[PDB]
Amino acid sequence: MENFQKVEKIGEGTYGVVYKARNKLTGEVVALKKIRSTAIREISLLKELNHPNIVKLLDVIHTENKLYLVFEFLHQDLKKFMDASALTGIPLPLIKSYLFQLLQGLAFCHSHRVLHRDLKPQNLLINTEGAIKLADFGLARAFVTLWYRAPEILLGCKYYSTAVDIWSLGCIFAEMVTRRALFPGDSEIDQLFRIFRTLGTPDEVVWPGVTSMPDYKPSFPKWARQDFSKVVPPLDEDGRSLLSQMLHYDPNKRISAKAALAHPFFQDVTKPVPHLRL
Ligand X SMILES: NS(=O)(=O)c1cccc2c(O)cccc12
Which stretches of the chain bind ligand X, using CB under 6 A?
10-11, 13, 18, 31, 55, 71-74, 77, 122-123, 125, 135-136
Residue nearest to ligand X (CB): 11
Of residues 58 and 206, the one with the C-beta less far from ligand X: 58
Of the residues 59, 118, 165, 236, which is catalytic? 118
Is 136 marked within a binding site? yes
Q: How many CA atoms lie within 13 A of 124 on its CB side?
A: 26
Q: According to the annotation, is 120 in a ligand binding site?
A: yes
Q: Which residue, 108 or 137, has its beta carbon nearer to ligand X?
A: 137
Beta carbon of residue 24, minimum distance to ligand X (angstroms, whole number): 18
79 among annotated binding-site residues: no
234 upstream amide cis, omega within 30 of 0: yes
Bridge-partner residues for 19, per DSSP? 9, 32
The answer to whether residues 138 and 169 touch, using CB atoms and an 8 Å cutoff, is: no
HSE on the CB side for 52, CA within 13 Å? Answer: 9
Q: Catalytic: 118? A: yes
DSSP state of 201: -
14 is in an annotated binding site: yes
Q: Which is nearer to ligand X, 73 or 216 (CB)?
A: 73
Nearer to ligand X, 75 or 258 (CB): 75
Q: φ, ψ for residue 63 (rounded to 5)?
A: -155, 145
Torsion of CA 108, 49, 128, 31, to 10 degrees: 150
* Residue (42 or 72) nearer to ligand X, CB: 72
- What is each CA distance from 244 to 135, 154, 170, 196, 255, in whole angstroms? 25, 19, 8, 14, 9
Contacts of 275 (CB under 8 A, 6+ apart): none
Beta strand segments in 127-217, E: 132-134
Closest residue by Cα to residue 125 from 134, 117, 116? 134
Q: Is 18 annotated as a binding residue?
A: yes
- 11 marked as part of a ligand binding site: yes
Annotated binding site for Mg(2+): 123, 136
Residues acting as catalytic residues: 118
